[PDB]
Amino acid sequence: CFLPKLFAKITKKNMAHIR
């Protein structure tokens, strides 16, 4: 709900780098 992925879904790099 309050956690949109406007850029969370478009990002396929830093995402898999977060952890």
How many individual helices?
Answer: 1
Radius of gyration: 9 Å
Approximate shape: elongated
Main sheet record: none
Taking the alpha carbons of the first and last residues, their distance comes to 23 Å
Strand-pairing-aware structural class: mainly alpha
Instruction: Give me the count of strands.
Output: 0
Beta-strand content estimate? under 5%
Q: H/E series, N to C?
A: H
Oligomer: monomer
Helix content: 10-25%
Explain how this protein is built:
The structure is a monomer. The chain is mainly alpha-helical. The radius of gyration is 9 Å and the shape is elongated. Helix content is 21%, strand content 0%.
Strand and helix layout:
Layout: H1 14-17
Provide tags for this entry:
monomer; 19 residues; mainly alpha; 1 helix; elongated; antimicrobial protein; cyana 2.1; monomeric; designed CAY1
In short:
The protein has one helix and no strands.
